[PDB]
Amino acid sequence: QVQLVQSGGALVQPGASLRLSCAASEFSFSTHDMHWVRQAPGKGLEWVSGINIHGGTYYPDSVKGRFTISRDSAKNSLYLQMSSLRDGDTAVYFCARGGKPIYYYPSWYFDLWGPGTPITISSASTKGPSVFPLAPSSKSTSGGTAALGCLVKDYFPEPVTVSWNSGALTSGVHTFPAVLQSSGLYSLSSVVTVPSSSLGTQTYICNVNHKPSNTKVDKRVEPK
Amino acid sequence: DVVMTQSPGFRSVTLKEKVSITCQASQTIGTNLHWYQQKPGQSPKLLIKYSSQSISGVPSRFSGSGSGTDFTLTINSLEADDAATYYCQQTNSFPCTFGPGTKVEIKRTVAAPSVFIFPPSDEQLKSGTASVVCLLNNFYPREAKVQWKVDNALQSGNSQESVTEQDSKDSTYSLSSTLTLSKADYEKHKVYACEVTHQGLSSPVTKSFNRGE
């Protein structure tokens, strides 16, 4: 019911200004304090911006002067405007709703989180992935089950998201963490185990999405 | 700022056991302390607020205690889906700050991997590259050795590995190994194989194929 939806991941260069956006579903921004919390890759959580119902803003010294949080309740929009970005700003940015206080102004604890927006700061350019099928064969079967998947090769930056049959196939899926290639690009694979007997009647399509480059690919995986 | 410390940084525990992870603040924060749960690829989730108050929808096996500087989160009976990282957060002094997190691993029974191998696709060969993938599915513990052999010749310097996080249902891991060659080098040899060694395998497993079979 209640949730938060955020804008897509992106790549920007050092010194650039960038605006993120977050929207609410089944609740209003006008009666809840909202915040932005970021998580650098492989690191913990850091609160970076907050706004109370009055419209007053709070910032930590780590980003004060560079980040600006704003709100447009009539448009159902929460914004984070970042400026003078640098490598240290690479992180996933969550919008988060402040929780109900127990004392008689934000409580500073968060009862609802968005899915996060992955922002990478780098001097390199974006590159969409190439998707190749991992066809099920006699060398990928066992005890009446078969393994198949897709290979997502040569993209930058992270992340790429992979679903199967537009989200209808989830059981038995394994999407591996990306590996860094010597060229500086990333690669990963996504696999799933299915019944061997139904390979002739069922269809298996892996859906790849790389928002930083606005690339979407749907690859049909058939036996060979 | 207040520094939040959590120790130890990693715990490995058996199903149904009781676990207690600790959090310590560099100064008194009263009971302005909260606990969150996060799994790889997901957003944090609030478990406990103000030291010991319960949250709607959170299983009852979670509980917290502590006042002043020392705090504890307890999971009464550890379940499979409890594999995750747990963070504490102080809200007594501006700015609020999180701890570094404690990662919980489930200790289950040994399980040998299921091994599969995939030849390169004709679409990739048309582009001038050939990737061979070796898949190790659902095993425990995470330690595993994979070796590539081309025409019985042990390879080195041309492969890359990746392991998944712990599965939230069966507490196993999965691993992928990708051998990458050029089309020219790929068509110089005929036999491609990956050899797997694991604690759950009394003898090594070898999956192979012949180019153009």
| Residue B50 belongs to domain with CATH number | 2.60.40.10
Domain count of the fold of chain B: 2
Contacts A60 to B, Cβ<8 Å: 95
Instruction: Report the gap between the CA of B53 and the closest CA in chain A (Å).
Output: 10
SS3 content of chain A, % helix, strand, coil (to 5): 10, 50, 40
Chain B residues in contact with A102 by the CB 8 A cut-off are: 50, 53
Contacts of B203 (CB under 8 A, 6+ apart): none
B66: Cα within 13 Å, side-chain hemisphere? 27
Radius of gyration, alpha carbons of chain B: 23
Q: Which two tokens stand for residue B67?
A: 């006042």
Return d(Cα B131, Cα A16) in angstroms, integer.
37
Among B66, B89, B107, residue at a domain's last position: B107
Find out whether A92 and A7 touch, Cβ atoms under 8 Å.
Answer: no
* One domain, residues B103 and B9: yes
Sole residue written with tokens 């207040």: B2
Residues B91 and B121 in one domain: no
Phi, psi of B106 (to 5 degrees): -90, 130
User: Choosing among A33, A95, A140, which should be mutated to test the B contact, i.e. which has the most B CBs within 10 A?
Assistant: A140
What technique was this entry resolved by? X-ray
Helix (H, G, I), strand (E, B) or coil at A27: coil
Contact B115, B207 (CB under 8 A): yes
Stated in angstroms to one decimal place, the resolution of this structure is 2.2
Q: Are residues B22 and B91 in the same domain?
A: yes
CA–CA separation, B148 vs B117, rounded Å? Answer: 11
Q: Which of A69, A105, A132 to mutate to test the interface with B (most CBs of B within 10 A)?
A: A132
Answer with the one of B59, B86, B107 that is the final residue of a domain.
B107
The Cα–Cα gap between B206 and A41 comes to 36
For residues A36 and A69, the answer to whether their CB atoms sit within 8 Å is yes
CA dihedral B22, B26, B29, B32 (to 10 degrees): -50
Burial class (CB in 10 A: 0-12, 13-18, 19+), A51: buried
B121 exposed, middle or buried (CB, 10 Å; 0-12, 13-18, 19+)? buried
Number of H helices, E strands in chain A: 0, 20
Considering the domain architecture, whether residues B18 and B87 belong to the same structural domain is answered as yes
CB A135 within 8 A of CB A147: no
Which of B107, B132, B162 is a domain's end point? B107
What distance in Å separates residue A17's CA from the closest CA in chain B? 24
CA of A9 to nearest chain B CA: how many angstroms apart? 14
> How many angstroms away from the CA of A110 is the closest CA of chain B?
7
Is A105 in CB contact (< 8 Å) with chain B? no
Residues 6+ apart with CB under 8 A from B98: A44, A45, A46, B4, B36, B87, B88, B89
Single-letter residue type at B212: G
- B137–A109: do the CB atoms touch at under 8 Å? no
- Partner residue facing B131 (CB), from A60, A113, A151: A151
**Nearest chain A residue to B102, by CA:** A44
Please report, for residues A180, B165, B181, B204, the alpha-carbon distance to residue B146 in angstroms, rounded to integers and kept in the order given: 19, 18, 17, 10
- In whole angstroms, what is the distance from residue A221 CA to residue B148 CA? 25
CB contact under 8 A, A188 and B162: yes
Separation of alpha carbons B63 and B53, rounded Å: 8
Residues B175 and B142 both lie in one domain? yes
Dihedrals φ, ψ of A173, to 5°? -90, 140
Mapped to the 3 state alphabet, what secondary structure does chain B carry? CCCEEEECCEEEEECCCCEEEEEEECCCCCCCEEEEEECCCCCCEEEEECCCEECCCCCCCEEEEECCCEEEEEECCCCHHHCEEEEEEECCCCCCEECCCEEEEEECCCECCEEEEECCCHHHHHCCEEEEEEEEEEEECCCCEEEEEECCEECCCCEEEEECCCCCCCCCEEEEEEEEEEHHHHCCCCEEEEEEECCCCCCCEEEEEECCC
**Residue of chain A whose alpha carbon sits nearest to that of B161:** A179
Give the contacts of B76 (CB within 8 A, at least 6 positions apart). B18, B60, B61, B62, B63
Q: Are residues B9 and B97 in the same domain?
A: yes
Same domain, B132 and B101: no
- For residue A13, give the 3-state DSSP assignment: coil
A139 touches B209 (CB < 8 A): yes
Distances in Å between the alpha carbon of B186 and those of A67, A134, B128, B192? Answer: 51, 17, 10, 9
Which residues are bridge partners to B205 per DSSP? B196
SS3 A213: helix
- Tell me how far apart the terminal alpha carbons of chain B are, to the nearest angstrom: 65
Shared domain check, B59 and B145:
no
B178 neighbourhood in chain A, CB within 8 Å: 151, 179, 187, 189
Distance CA A164, CA A177 (A): 17
B73 in Cβ contact with B86 (< 8 Å): yes
Same domain (yes/no): B66, B128: no
Mark whether B68 and B124 lie in a shared domain. Answer: no
Q: How close is the nearest chain B Cα to the Cα of A94, in Å?
A: 8
CA separation for the pair B147, A93 (Å, rounded): 39
Across the A/B interface, how many CB contacts are shorter than 8 Å? 115
β pairing state of B153-154 and B102-107:
unpaired
Query: Given its phi and psi angles, is residue B60 left (phi above 0), alpha (psi -120 to 50 degrees) or beta?
Result: alpha
| Residue B118 distance to chain A (closest CA, Å) | 6
Residue range of the domain that includes B8: 4-107
Same domain, B86 and B120: no
The structural domains of chain A, ordered by start, are 3-121 (2.60.40.10), 130-221 (2.60.40.10)
Nearest alpha-carbon partner for B176 in B201, B193, B155, B159: B159
Q: Would you give the end-to-end CA distance of chain A in angstroms?
A: 44
A223 touching B, CB under 8 A? no
Helix (H) or strand (E) holding A154: strand A145-155
Q: From residue B87, how far is each of B33, B46, B99, B175 by CA, in Å?
A: 10, 10, 6, 27
Residues in chain B within 8 Å Cβ distance of A45: 36, 44, 87, 89, 98
Among B52, B96, B125, the strongest candidate for a mutation testing the A interface, having the largest count of A CBs within 10 A, is B96
Residue the block writes with tokens 């989160």? B73
Residues B8 and B100 in one domain: yes
